[PDB]
């Protein structure tokens, strides 16, 4: 594995510029989105939680295409407010339920260190 804990205070420094292969070594799901919600990175742990194939979802829009159940004030709303402000660091539980067995997760969205990039970290609860 890669030795990084969900919710660590400096997680954006540790994961910075991690390539796809190292991201697959994390204990929790990790998605990287651009400012519009398009998927830039998506690791194996997340695919194990949600059933999505990490290589097929890259390039899709998370909120419009892959995860409509997050198209809501409580998830996408928080994401888009953080993007617009250039600051994002929010943790909350949520239920993923689009075309899947409803799965309760803890979500941590945090602005990446690099440019037009935002992390969505996920673990089961
Ligand atoms: C609800 O539509 C959520 C769907 C979803 C969440 C997270 C993923 O990695 C994939 C699909």
UniProtKB/Swiss-Prot annotation:
Query: Which GO molecular function annotations are given, in alphabetical order?
Result: identical protein binding; photoreceptor activity
What's the family? Belongs to the photoactive yellow protein family.
UniProt domain PAS: residue ranges? 23-86
Cited function: Photoactive blue light protein. Probably functions as a photoreceptor for a negative phototaxis response.
Q: Which Gene Ontology BP annotations are present?
A: phototransduction; regulation of DNA-templated transcription
User: Which NCBIfam families does the record associate with it?
Assistant: photo_yellow (TIGR02373)
Q: What is this protein called?
A: Photoactive yellow protein
Do you know which Pfam families this protein is assigned to? PAS (PF00989)
Give the source species: Halorhodospira halophila (Ectothiorhodospira halophila)
Q: What CDD domains does the annotation carry? A: PAS
What PTMs does it carry? The 4-hydroxycinnamic acid (p-coumaric acid) chromophore is covalently bound via a thioester linkage.
Q: Which InterPro entries match?
A: PAS, PAS-like_dom_sf, PAS_fold, PYP
Superkingdom of source = Bacteria
* Quaternary assembly: Monomer.
Keywords on this record? Chromophore, Photoreceptor protein, Receptor, Sensory transduction
Where on the chain is S-(4-hydroxycinnamyl)cysteine found, per UniProt? Answer: 69
């Amino acid at each position: 594995m890669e030795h990084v804990a969900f919710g660590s205070e400096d997680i954006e420094n540790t994961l910075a510029k991690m390539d796809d292969g190292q991201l697959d070594g994390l204990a929790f799901g990790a998605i990287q989105l651009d400012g519009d919600g398009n998927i830039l990175q998506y690791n194996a742990a997340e695919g194990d939680i949600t059933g999505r194939d990490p290589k097929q979802v890259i390039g899709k829009n998370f909120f419009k295409d892959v995860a409509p159940c997050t198209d809501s004030p409580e998830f996408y709303g928080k994401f888009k407010e953080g993007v617009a402000s250039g600051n994002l660091n929010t943790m909350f539980e949520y239920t993923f339920d689009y075309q899947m067995t409803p799965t309760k997760v803890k979500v941590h969205m945090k602005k990446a260190l690099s440019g037009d990039s935002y992390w969505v970290f996920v673990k089961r609860v």
